[PDB]
Amino acid sequence: DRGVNTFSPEGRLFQVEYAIEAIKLGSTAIGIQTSEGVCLAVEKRITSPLMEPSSIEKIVEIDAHIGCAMSGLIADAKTLIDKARVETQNHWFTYNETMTVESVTQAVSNLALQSRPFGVALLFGGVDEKGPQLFHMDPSGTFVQCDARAIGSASEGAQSSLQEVYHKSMTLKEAIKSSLIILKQVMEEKLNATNIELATVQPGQNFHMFTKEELEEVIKDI
Amino acid sequence: DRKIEFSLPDLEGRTHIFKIHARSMSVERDIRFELLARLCPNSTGAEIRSVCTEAGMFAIRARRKIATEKDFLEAVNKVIKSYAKFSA
Amino acid sequence: FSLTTFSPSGKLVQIEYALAAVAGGAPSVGIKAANGVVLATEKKQKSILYDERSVHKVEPITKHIGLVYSGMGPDYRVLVHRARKLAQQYYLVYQEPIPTAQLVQRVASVMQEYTQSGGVRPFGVSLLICGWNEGRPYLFQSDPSGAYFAWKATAMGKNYVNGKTFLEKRYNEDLELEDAIHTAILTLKESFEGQMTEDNIEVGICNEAGFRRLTPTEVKDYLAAI
Amino acid sequence: NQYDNDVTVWSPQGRIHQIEYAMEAVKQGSATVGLKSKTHAVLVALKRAQSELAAHQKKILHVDNHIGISIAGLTADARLLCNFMRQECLDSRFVFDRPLPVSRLVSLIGSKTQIPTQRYGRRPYGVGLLIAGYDDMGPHIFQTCPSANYFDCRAMSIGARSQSARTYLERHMSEFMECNLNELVKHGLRALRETLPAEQDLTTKNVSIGIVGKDLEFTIYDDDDVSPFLEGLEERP
Amino acid sequence: GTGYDLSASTFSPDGRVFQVEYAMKAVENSSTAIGIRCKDGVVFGVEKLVLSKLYEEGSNKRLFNVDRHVGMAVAGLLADARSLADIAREEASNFRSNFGYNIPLKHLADRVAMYVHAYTLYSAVRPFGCSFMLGSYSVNDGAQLYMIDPSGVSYGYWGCAIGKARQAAKTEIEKLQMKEMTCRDIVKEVAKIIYIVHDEVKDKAFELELSWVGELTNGRHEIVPKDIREEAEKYAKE
Amino acid sequence: TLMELLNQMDGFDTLHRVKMIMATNRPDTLDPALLRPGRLDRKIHIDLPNEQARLDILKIHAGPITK
Amino acid sequence: GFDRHITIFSPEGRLYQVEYAFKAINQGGLTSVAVRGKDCAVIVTQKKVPDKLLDSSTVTHLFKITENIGCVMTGMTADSRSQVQRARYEAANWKYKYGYEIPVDMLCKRIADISQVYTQNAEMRPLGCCMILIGIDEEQGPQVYKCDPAGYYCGFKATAAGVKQTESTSFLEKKVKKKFDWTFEQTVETAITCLSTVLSIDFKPSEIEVGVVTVENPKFRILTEAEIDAHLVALAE
Amino acid sequence: YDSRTTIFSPEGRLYQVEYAMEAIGHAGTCLGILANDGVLLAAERRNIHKLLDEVFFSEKIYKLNEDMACSVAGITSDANVLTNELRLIAQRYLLQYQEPIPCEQLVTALCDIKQAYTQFGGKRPFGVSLLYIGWDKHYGFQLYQSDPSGNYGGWKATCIGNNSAAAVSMLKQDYKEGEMTLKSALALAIKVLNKTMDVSKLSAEKVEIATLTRENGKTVIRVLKQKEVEQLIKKHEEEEAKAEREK
Amino acid sequence: KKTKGPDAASKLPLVTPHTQCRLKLLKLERIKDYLLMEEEFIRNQEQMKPLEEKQEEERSKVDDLRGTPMSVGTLEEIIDDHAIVSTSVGSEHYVSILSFVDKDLLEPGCSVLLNHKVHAVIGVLMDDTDPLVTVMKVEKAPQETYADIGGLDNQIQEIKESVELPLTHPEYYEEMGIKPPKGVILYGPPGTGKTLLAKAVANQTSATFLRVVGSELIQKYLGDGPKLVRELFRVAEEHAPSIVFIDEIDAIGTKRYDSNSGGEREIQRTMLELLNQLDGFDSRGDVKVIMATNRIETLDPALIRPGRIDRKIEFPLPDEKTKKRIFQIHTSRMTLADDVTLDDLIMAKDDLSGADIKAICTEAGLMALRERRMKVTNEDFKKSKENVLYKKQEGTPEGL
Numbered sequence A: 001d002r003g004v005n006t007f008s009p010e011g012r013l014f015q016v017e018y019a020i021e022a023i024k025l026g027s028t029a030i031g032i033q034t035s036e037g038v039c040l041a042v043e044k045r046i047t048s049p050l051m052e053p054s055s056i057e058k059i060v061e062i063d064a065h066i067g068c069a070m071s072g073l074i075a076d077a078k079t080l081i082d083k084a085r086v087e088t089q090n091h092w093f094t095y096n097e098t099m100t101v102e103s104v105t106q107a108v109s110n111l112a113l114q115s116r117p118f119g120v121a122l123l124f125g126g127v128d129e130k131g132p133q134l135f136h137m138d139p140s141g142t143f144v145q146c147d148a149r150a151i152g153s154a155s156e157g158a159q160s161s162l163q164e165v166y167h168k169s170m171t172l173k174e175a176i177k178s179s180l181i182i183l184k185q186v187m188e189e190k191l192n193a194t195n196i197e198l199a200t201v202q203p204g205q206n207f208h209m210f211t212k213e214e215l216e217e218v219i220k221d222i
Numbered sequence B: 001d002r003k004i005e006f007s008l009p010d011l012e013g014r015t016h017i018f019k020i021h022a023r024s025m026s027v028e029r030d031i032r033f034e035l036l037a038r039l040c041p042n043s044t045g046a047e048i049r050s051v052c053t054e055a056g057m058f059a060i061r062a063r064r065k066i067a068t069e070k071d072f073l074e075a076v077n078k079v080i081k082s083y084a085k086f087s088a
Numbered sequence C: 001f002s003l004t005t006f007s008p009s010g011k012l013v014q015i016e017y018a019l020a021a022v023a024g025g026a027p028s029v030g031i032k033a034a035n036g037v038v039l040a041t042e043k044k045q046k047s048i049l050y051d052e053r054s055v056h057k058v059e060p061i062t063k064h065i066g067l068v069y070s071g072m073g074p075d076y077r078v079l080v081h082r083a084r085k086l087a088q089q090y091y092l093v094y095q096e097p098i099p100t101a102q103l104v105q106r107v108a109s110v111m112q113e114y115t116q117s118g119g120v121r122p123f124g125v126s127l128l129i130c131g132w133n134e135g136r137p138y139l140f141q142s143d144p145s146g147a148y149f150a151w152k153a154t155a156m157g158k159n160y161v162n163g164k165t166f167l168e169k170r171y172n173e174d175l176e177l178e179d180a181i182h183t184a185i186l187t188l189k190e191s192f193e194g195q196m197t198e199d200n201i202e203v204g205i206c207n208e209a210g211f212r213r214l215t216p217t218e219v220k221d222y223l224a225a226i
Numbered sequence D: 001n002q003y004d005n006d007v008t009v010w011s012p013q014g015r016i017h018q019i020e021y022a023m024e025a026v027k028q029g030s031a032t033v034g035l036k037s038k039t040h041a042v043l044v045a046l047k048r049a050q051s052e053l054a055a056h057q058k059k060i061l062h063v064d065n066h067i068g069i070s071i072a073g074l075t076a077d078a079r080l081l082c083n084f085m086r087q088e089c090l091d092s093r094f095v096f097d098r099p100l101p102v103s104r105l106v107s108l109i110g111s112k113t114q115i116p117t118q119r120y121g122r123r124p125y126g127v128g129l130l131i132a133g134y135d136d137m138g139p140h141i142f143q144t145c146p147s148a149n150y151f152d153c154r155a156m157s158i159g160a161r162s163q164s165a166r167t168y169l170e171r172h173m174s175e176f177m178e179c180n181l182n183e184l185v186k187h188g189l190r191a192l193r194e195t196l197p198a199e200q201d202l203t204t205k206n207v208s209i210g211i212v213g214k215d216l217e218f219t220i221y222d223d224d225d226v227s228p229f230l231e232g233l234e235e236r237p
Numbered sequence E: 001g002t003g004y005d006l007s008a009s010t011f012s013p014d015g016r017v018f019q020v021e022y023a024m025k026a027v028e029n030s031s032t033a034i035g036i037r038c039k040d041g042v043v044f045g046v047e048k049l050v051l052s053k054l055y056e057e058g059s060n061k062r063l064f065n066v067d068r069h070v071g072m073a074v075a076g077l078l079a080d081a082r083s084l085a086d087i088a089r090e091e092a093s094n095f096r097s098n099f100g101y102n103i104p105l106k107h108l109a110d111r112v113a114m115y116v117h118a119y120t121l122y123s124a125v126r127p128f129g130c131s132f133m134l135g136s137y138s139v140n141d142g143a144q145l146y147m148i149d150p151s152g153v154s155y156g157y158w159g160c161a162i163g164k165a166r167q168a169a170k171t172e173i174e175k176l177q178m179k180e181m182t183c184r185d186i187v188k189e190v191a192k193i194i195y196i197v198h199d200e201v202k203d204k205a206f207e208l209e210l211s212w213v214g215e216l217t218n219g220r221h222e223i224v225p226k227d228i229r230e231e232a233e234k235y236a237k238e
Numbered sequence F: 001t002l003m004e005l006l007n008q009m010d011g012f013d014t015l016h017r018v019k020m021i022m023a024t025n026r027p028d029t030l031d032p033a034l035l036r037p038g039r040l041d042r043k044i045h046i047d048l049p050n051e052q053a054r055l056d057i058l059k060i061h062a063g064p065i066t067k
Numbered sequence G: 001g002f003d004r005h006i007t008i009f010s011p012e013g014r015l016y017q018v019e020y021a022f023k024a025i026n027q028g029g030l031t032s033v034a035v036r037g038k039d040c041a042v043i044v045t046q047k048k049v050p051d052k053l054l055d056s057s058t059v060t061h062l063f064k065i066t067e068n069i070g071c072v073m074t075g076m077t078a079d080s081r082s083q084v085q086r087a088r089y090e091a092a093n094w095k096y097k098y099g100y101e102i103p104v105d106m107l108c109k110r111i112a113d114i115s116q117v118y119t120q121n122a123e124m125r126p127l128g129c130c131m132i133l134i135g136i137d138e139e140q141g142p143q144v145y146k147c148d149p150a151g152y153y154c155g156f157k158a159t160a161a162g163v164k165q166t167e168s169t170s171f172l173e174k175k176v177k178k179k180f181d182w183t184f185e186q187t188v189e190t191a192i193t194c195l196s197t198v199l200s201i202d203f204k205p206s207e208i209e210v211g212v213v214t215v216e217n218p219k220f221r222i223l224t225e226a227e228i229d230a231h232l233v234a235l236a237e
Numbered sequence H: 001y002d003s004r005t006t007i008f009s010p011e012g013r014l015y016q017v018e019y020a021m022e023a024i025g026h027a028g029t030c031l032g033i034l035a036n037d038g039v040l041l042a043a044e045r046r047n048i049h050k051l052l053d054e055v056f057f058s059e060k061i062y063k064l065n066e067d068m069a070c071s072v073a074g075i076t077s078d079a080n081v082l083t084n085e086l087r088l089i090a091q092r093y094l095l096q097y098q099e100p101i102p103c104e105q106l107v108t109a110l111c112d113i114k115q116a117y118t119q120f121g122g123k124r125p126f127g128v129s130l131l132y133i134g135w136d137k138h139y140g141f142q143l144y145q146s147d148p149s150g151n152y153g154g155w156k157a158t159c160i161g162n163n164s165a166a167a168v169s170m171l172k173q174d175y176k177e178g179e180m181t182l183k184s185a186l187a188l189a190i191k192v193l194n195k196t197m198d199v200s201k202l203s204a205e206k207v208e209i210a211t212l213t214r215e216n217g218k219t220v221i222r223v224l225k226q227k228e229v230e231q232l233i234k235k236h237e238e239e240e241a242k243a244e245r246e247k
Numbered sequence I: 001k002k003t004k005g006p007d008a009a010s011k012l013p014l015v016t017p018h019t020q021c022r023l024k025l026l027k028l029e030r031i032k033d034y035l036l037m038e039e040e041f042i043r044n045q046e047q048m049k050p051l052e053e054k055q056e057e058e059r060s061k062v063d064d065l066r067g068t069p070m071s072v073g074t075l076e077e078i079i080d081d082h083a084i085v086s087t088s089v090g091s092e093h094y095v096s097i098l099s100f101v102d103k104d105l106l107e108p109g110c111s112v113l114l115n116h117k118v119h120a121v122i123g124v125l126m127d128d129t130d131p132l133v134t135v136m137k138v139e140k141a142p143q144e145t146y147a148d149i150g151g152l153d154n155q156i157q158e159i160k161e162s163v164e165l166p167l168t169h170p171e172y173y174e175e176m177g178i179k180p181p182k183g184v185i186l187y188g189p190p191g192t193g194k195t196l197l198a199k200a201v202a203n204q205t206s207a208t209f210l211r212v213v214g215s216e217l218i219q220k221y222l223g224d225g226p227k228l229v230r231e232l233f234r235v236a237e238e239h240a241p242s243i244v245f246i247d248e249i250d251a252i253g254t255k256r257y258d259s260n261s262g263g264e265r266e267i268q269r270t271m272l273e274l275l276n277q278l279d280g281f282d283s284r285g286d287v288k289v290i291m292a293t294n295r296i297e298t299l300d301p302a303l304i305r306p307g308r309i310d311r312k313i314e315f316p317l318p319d320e321k322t323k324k325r326i327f328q329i330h331t332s333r334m335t336l337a338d339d340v341t342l343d344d345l346i347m348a349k350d351d352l353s354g355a356d357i358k359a360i361c362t363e364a365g366l367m368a369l370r371e372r373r374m375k376v377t378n379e380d381f382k383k384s385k386e387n388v389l390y391k392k393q394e395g396t397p398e399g400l
């Protein structure tokens, strides 16, 4: 019914079926986990030119070896990303090593529903001893390992396209172009560098911004 | 007796519904309509008829009555309206 | 929610219903005379099975503060217990002021836990307070939601309207001696159905010497020659 | 229907309705079976996959060397129960250095889940638990429903279309005590395979196995670890 | 009811608590039970419906041991019944820790009944959906047996029954002549009464959980030896 | 509801030729407050017929039967 | 609305919840009578025992709150026992805080204050049990009081509670209006004949349980079968 | 279960707070006028039943601090607790800083507490709006009006009562800054009170007025007693008679 | 029971100046002269008769057999020769009419005459003048045209294309074999919406028009809100194919109310009957349903889908030029001033809609007529701004 805790008469409590469909109002984001690394592509969707593009960010580095892409209420995603950073730093401080992306996703999932549930979906991606990994976490405190995931308003179409354009033995160079051509097909405008953000994951590199308006070398090919 | 049901079109059902609907209009089957059939999971036969309806409306909007070889425009209008049905 | 609540646009509907409840039926007149204050009320027990020396309507909160009330006696008990505790706390804090009339205003003000923190359901009793430790008497009324009114003469019963009309027509006045209790009994008589007797009518008096609940002997003495 | 709105309220016809709805949370979940033996307890869980790109999610959760659980239902308040059971088993380890017997753990879980069924504003834990443990009295399989009424079972299954698996287990439960490890695991695999529609079939990627035995601590077998058990499937979808 | 039967804190227009009036219905619907005070002890007995043969030997047993000499035979919503059994165990342990010795059955029943009444008094919490007999024996106080309804109070019972068929059991219970019959024949007779009550006429096969307390067990409420009471079940069958 | 018929006793018993016979099954639970003077009052004992009544009613039952 | 559903003041200026809770006392099918006398105070209530499988030893509605105060309860038995336990706790706590034993009027006042707190607020509900407590008080003679689910504590000489409480009160009003003091034979006989006229079963000396507190003999004597039988024989003479 | 309304509107309005603020206009009548070397408050005595004794010595005007005084126009139940809290805040500031609290800071604290009351929790908004007159070292004589919305305003001539619109219109028409003095401010206040109270020739009992003046390094808050008030009334009556007859 | 009405009125609304001038004078003289000549024509034709032929063969055969006494009753059924007529007080007659029979005008459920005595139908009253049960075609084909509203060129072109896909070029998608009755979903600020009507009059220049505004949350057990509109659009197909303007009920009557069950039964009935009628696979006809609202958010997902309800159109606020045009249109009838104070009233204005423009124009004339009566009141230059303030925009205590 309307109660955040009461179950539905059929099978599954409501108001969490309502929180999950908040990536619908959220913006599109796609991530590919390849053997080379993890490619995280989002779109900023600036509404007015006066707003600084640097201000609007959907991808934030939780740590040097974990990057996260939000899709939904950026307000709730700020809290979730802050908790992810705090948990990663606490684990590193306790055990003097790099917390696994799976463990970070598990902690975020534990904190997701414990207050009305958070209405954001995160795409965690980072390197670990088990190679590069990517996880799709969902507002209803549920996380799943994924290799090529899409999320946002057009999650269905983007995921369907990714399902047939992805192959198990791809590299970063093909992954970025596939994600960008998909994004261009999903969005309304073109994939200008001021509107598209990209995040790369490397086994021997920290996850930095994609070349910062010198990334046109990856959109001119598109 | 004999309670039966369906209303669950799979890929083969959806593409056959595409074929019978494409029997109408000025379309032909050289279009890769299997791609759109994959793109809509369980889109009834009602929405397939709507999608063929939309493809006709896009052809007249372009003012080209041709639709046998108008396949790229067929695919474009079908995909954009599938986007709008899912999210408008 | 858990306080005095239910206030719509320009109204206090729950408080108004509480005031409809305190309309009651116990007249409980009060008169502020020059020498002191008289709080008289009607104890019309159902049948003769009940007792009149068992329960009382007039309660001495402290040495010279007396209290009478209206409908919802069970609420009135808790209220008078709270008032006794509050007066005792004030006297303990400000030690030995013999605080009655410099406290009657203060105890009436501290009757804010009375209603301003209603307790989900507001109290359903309006109470008259008398004190005379200032060289002058004091009669105050606290209602289920308001505050001190500082009356000179009023009633809070089923016929409180015509009781107050009787009080003003009979000229509560200012030169009246302490024995305006005759006029208080007359005002009760108007809102009384029966041959009122000593146990039927309970009255307390608060003069400058102190407060005292008149025993049935003096109540019957006053009721004689009426 | 008014009386079905809240957990606290009681239906005039008898039992309350919110708890009855809570059991539909475990009905609406991927199937899982769990069977005892003379010496081993085996859980066969259907790892339900979102899409071919995404993984098949995680089932058969790990609790301790001698206890392992399989969830079926609302995954949110299921990792919570897993944390509670892990914490209780570790508390027992810490206090008297012995594995917490499974029956006491199940009683603790039932008591813990009973309170939300009576406290206002608290939804019942709509999670179906198939606890496999090896205490000193041989293997044990327990089913915990959101109604907080646990059960002991020779072989029980929960999930979508789990009634067919229940019937197969019942018909073959006579020959369960005297079965080799692989034989019992194949019994469970046949039981789970009978659950999904004929189009679906067992794969190394969509199944998980939890085995606990006298000398074998609880182990979660999957694709490479499952393939030796998956051989000799006797496929009749 | 309609409007007044939503929370236990809401009295009926006639002055009744419909939440408990409905909680009694769950006990009326669940499987039955019986407890008889024999001459020197108390004998319990409960039929339990094996809803599926997938279950092992008798589990989630309607009988419970709340203390060394005290046993609880419960019927109704079984999870809340187990929680209440845990409450009773904690109460007995606390009494033993504070006042020493063993908790008298009348006081234990009174305390658990007061706790149940506390749970039915308020609004946020709901009345317990279970009714149970507490049976105990000691040399000093003989054998006592108190039955607690989902909202009512403990009452001394020579013989009591609860659950699906209370009247049908009670008729033959009152037919039986207690107060002079030893606990052995009472064990035979309680199984006889349970088998007289319908078991498979509309339901599945039922298991016979029977309990003991008495001088034959020097207190020490324990489940009857089922291997040797299978013959008692056989006599019940005849 | 029986007390309602009880206070009906002032239904002009002088004027009205109305009586009320209470054919209960067992007089065990009959609200003994309803057997005081002014209540139903009189009770006549009827039980299972004795041997004499049994043979008499067998005779009258066999009366219509001529064999 | 919810004026008649929660403990809130009605728009007409009434409190319907306690008005219902009082009728709750009438519900349950029982009556009790209390008669104060010249020197003693005796109370009697019927003992409705359905079937003899119950223990007539413990089905009582009268209790000792302390060594000199005895109560009789009317209404729902669970709330009755809760209020009896509360009264016993209050008596013990008073004896601990203040050396002298708690006067019966003060105990009734405290119980009425608890009930008034219950009718205040909205989380809890009033207890549907009216308690008549008696006891000998020095410089006061026998004392009888009644606390009700509202918080109005009063009642004296002759007071009754239960289903047919009005008829008993009317008869006792007739008796007390007849100006003659009752000794420790007339008080008991008056109570017995009052309850018998209320419910004419002629009161076989097993279906009532009478409590007595005299002045020369304190304590709450729950008179045995022999004593009630002797009083009944003396009355019906 | 019942839940209170501290929420918005489909448009985005706090209609509960708005209704309370409008209800403040209903019942009560106070006005504050600021002049040089003296600031004064005028209050309308609503109930003048002859059966009172007037021993509280003040009903609308409340002395809240050595250097300030307020006047409520809302429900008296909230008015009492709000005045107590205001005095407590002022005296807490005096304890902390050993200096009389500036009027603006006091008003900001009170409006903060009212904003909290309308902001969080299932608590009713404080249905009371009150004026404040006071003097400080920084700004001298100041007048402030705060509504239950918690949005106070620094005024110099305002009314808060039932006919507050008519009273403020009369003020605007016959208000002159700078030239205004204490005596002319009293004349204006009595004139506007006579305008807003329908019964002409207002009795000194139905009007309660208090003036704050600055003596030699000390703030004196004198409530004008009956004789002084009716002498002001007599002077006003003389002025009215002269003005009417001279035409 | 209703097919058409005699449209012999609205004599040439195109009075070009609409202001008193010689041209408008001369146009009216031509209008009146023609009225004189038409009346003279018909009167001379009816008076100077073509021929005098007996009793026009009327009184000889039919009139006498019809008889003097008559009574009227509804006609119920038709059979090959007789006719089945339900006359007054529930009488039923099976008679063959042969005198003055007009079978086309007879029709079931129509008022016919009964000659008494030998009760036989003898005539019919085609007027009848009581088809008053549900009347929505009374305002059909409104006279408002494109020129009444300006500055909305993009929307006018869009709606015109969406509704001139039929009528004009129907073979276009007849060959494309789709026949989509998609209709148009109109957005727009609440300050507009009767323009959602004004832009609808562009299509109302062709065929008729039906309106359902406010309707109800069809609590009616039969429902039949959209179902009766379905019958009325069927009547529209019988007539010239009309459009259905359901502004504000596509919003409230079809709300994206997000509860599922126990929801006033409109969510069960109204939305489900709306998409059945909006799907071309169920009902034919050139009827185009214009769903106009001011709350785009409450678009139900069934209404959201362009697959069944295509041609989403957004109505924006007027721009500077649009404000100039609408102010020109509304003040054209009143001759605002000779100084033409046009741009000062709109240059700094923002969020001003058509209803506000009409209101300020009317109030400007009202204030001038109040006391400033000066024909083209020289005060109008600033009084137009005086009444363009007019307060009344929005008012809500302070909250600031």
Ligand SMILES: Nc1ncnc2c1ncn2[C@@H]1O[C@H](COP(=O)(O)OP(=O)(O)O)[C@@H](O)[C@H]1O
Binding pocket: I148, I149, I150, I151, I152, I190, I191, I192, I193, I194, I195, I196, I197, I198, I318, I325, I326, I329, I353, I354, I355, I356, I358
């Ligand atoms: N741009 C415009 N040009 C000419 N007339 C207009 C224009 N906009 C509105 N109107 C007229 O003003 C009236 C009110 O318009 P609208 O804003 O649609 O009303 P509402 O706001 O009440 O829905 C309409 O009947 C229309 O005839």
